[PDB]
Structure 1
Amino acid sequence: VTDPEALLLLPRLSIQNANAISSPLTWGFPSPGAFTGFVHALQRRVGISLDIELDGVGIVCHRFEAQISQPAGKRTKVFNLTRNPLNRDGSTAAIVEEGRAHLEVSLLLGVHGDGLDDHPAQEIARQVQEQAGAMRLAGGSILPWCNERFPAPNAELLMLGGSDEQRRKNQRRLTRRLLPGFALVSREALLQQHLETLRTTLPEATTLDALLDLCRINFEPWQVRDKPGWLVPIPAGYNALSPLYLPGEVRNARDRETPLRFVENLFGLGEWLSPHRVAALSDLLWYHHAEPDKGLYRWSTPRFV
């Protein structure tokens, strides 16, 4: 939750077959926890050989397409699946379902490290995108060159550099590279605001956002409600459901050096915004913040409003 000394625009990334499930109660764009884990993976595998510190991530999502279908008379939708290989006797496999989608996202990476003065900006940008072109972002492959990968160069920009006119000018020159984009932010305080509004009957927060991504048809003495924005339900972190265990206690863990607790994820709210409506760009970035003695592990955009 440090303030960023720079911003890094991974400019245009086609994602091949990402995970469009995101939670047990959503299905659209993937969870922003995947983006936080991606930028932390870049912090691991190249972010220490350049003496930098990559924390924030700004989601943009230019173009979206999911592999769904509505089944011919039904009003809801289903997912398109894949054939898995056959069983041991070659009979058939038990089908689990996974939603798959195609993203075209752009990433804004906050940089904090002391190596911003030791290295030229283009070398930092080139090595970051050349590493990120061999990784994956929501369980989905990050696609190489296509018919129109002309904005291939990454760009780096220090937000502190220059005068106030210079900072805001270079900001609005960055926003010309987010052209059909729609940034995703967290709007937790609006969830508590509407809960304090309609908390006459039931102050359960599940009912609140379960009555916000909707059209609310009120009747004659029809006055359907007005949408304040593109409010959509998001998953917003994890809450524990078990006492934490030692690194050797839990059977079949991913390793034997980290403690494991069984958790439950923790639903939230946020809404998609154009990159003109935001004031600056340092307020737009996602950060992971955990309270480990309790079970509150979450991510948000701190210092947005």
Structure 2
Amino acid sequence: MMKGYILLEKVNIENANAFNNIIVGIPAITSFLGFARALERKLNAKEIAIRINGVGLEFHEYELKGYKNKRGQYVTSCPLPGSIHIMNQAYIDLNMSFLLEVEGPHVDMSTCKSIKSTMETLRIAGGIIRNYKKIRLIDTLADIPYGYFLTLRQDNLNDAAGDDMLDKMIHALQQEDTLVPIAVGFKALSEVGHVEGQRDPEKDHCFVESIFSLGGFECSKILEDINSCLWRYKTEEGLYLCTII
């Protein structure tokens, strides 16, 4: 039982779901959190017994699946619908990297082969893995290549002019260009019982809606803390969420 962190370096994904609710481009972070949880479950199916809790995102390159129409606005592309008309979807080519806060025994020069074997049956936000560049276990603060980290900056999200989120989001968005909208977890309702029609009937069912906040990009050289990134799960009385504290 020792604390460490693994790095998934330069994972490029085609057709990742970039149309979560309102944000076109960067997907919801719960996609990456559930990807880390699916990797944790895949390693738990094997008898390695290794836990993962904490994930930070480092974006390198992005390609919205489209072009520019006249002046700079984007028009996006889509496949042809078939056997069961198109309604609303978008896709992206991401080239980003993962920091996974890894907590569990027997990590040094181990579990990398298991992660490599179990990664091939995984999709990041519904997109193909293709070829990630490397898996690394270097335990330094300056172990990051030249990328940009998407963190939770609750400064203009919290303190800005405007009475409420709506009359405050766009007003906090004019003066800062790096700051971007981010879907951050999701909670709506109650009645956690066992109503039918579930994907797995032996679980807890709910009717849940996405929630939103702000985010920002900082380089690998200039930074504040590891604790200012590496997003964590959190749970309350029906208010499941992901945050950095």
Question: Which of 182, 185, 189 pairs up with 1:237?
Answer: 185
Residue 131 (str. 1) matches residue 128 (str. 2): no
8 A Cα contact 1:185 1:300, kept in partner: no
Query: Per the alignment, in what secondary structure is the counterpart of residue 59 of structure 1?
Result: strand
8 A Cα contact 2:43 2:118, kept in partner: yes
8 A Cα contact 1:126 1:154, kept in partner: no
TM-score (norm 1): 0.73
Residues in 2 aligned to 1:266 and 1:144: alpha-carbon distance in whole angstroms: 32
Residue 42 (str. 1) matches residue 12 (str. 2): no
For these two proteins, the number of residue pairs brought into alignment is 243
The residue that corresponds to 1:164 in the other structure is none
User: Any residues of structure 2 matched to 1:111-260 within 5 Å, and which?
Assistant: 111-116=102-107, 121-144=108-131, 152-158=133-139, 170-172=140-142, 174-175=143-144, 178-179=145-146, 181-194=147-160, 198-199=161-162, 203-214=163-174, 225=175, 227=176, 230-240=178-188, 242-247=189-194, 249=195, 251-260=196-205
Q: Which amino acid aligns with 1:141?
A: I
- TM-aligned CA deviation for residue 211 of structure 1: 2.5
Higher relative contact order, chain-length normalized (CA < 8 Å, sep 6+): 2
TM-score (norm 2): 0.89
- TM-aligned CA deviation for residue 212 of structure 1: 2.9
Residues in 1 aligned to 2:26 and 2:134: alpha-carbon distance in whole angstroms: 26
Q: Which amino acid aligns with 2:98?
A: L
8 A Cα contact 1:234 1:270, kept in partner: yes
How much identity, in percent, do the aligned residues show? 24
Which ranges of structure 2 fall in alignment gaps of 5 or more residues? none
8 A Cα contact 2:152 2:229, kept in partner: no
Residues in 1 aligned to 2:156 and 2:172: alpha-carbon distance in whole angstroms: 11
Which ranges of structure 1 fall in alignment gaps of 5 or more residues? 88-93, 146-151, 159-169, 215-224
Please say which structure displays the higher CA radius of gyration: 1
- TM-aligned CA deviation for residue 277 of structure 1: 2.1
8 A Cα contact 1:287 1:300, kept in partner: yes
Residues in 2 aligned to 1:43 and 1:15: alpha-carbon distance in whole angstroms: 20
- Alpha-carbon distance change, 8 to 47 in structure 1, aligned in 2, over 3 angstroms: farther
- TM-aligned CA deviation for residue 66 of structure 1: 1.0
Root-mean-square deviation (Å): 2.2
Residues in 2 aligned to 1:269 and 1:14: alpha-carbon distance in whole angstroms: 24
8 A Cα contact 1:8 1:156, kept in partner: yes
8 A Cα contact 2:27 2:183, kept in partner: no
Give 1 or 2: higher helix fraction: 1
8 A Cα contact 1:6 1:112, kept in partner: yes
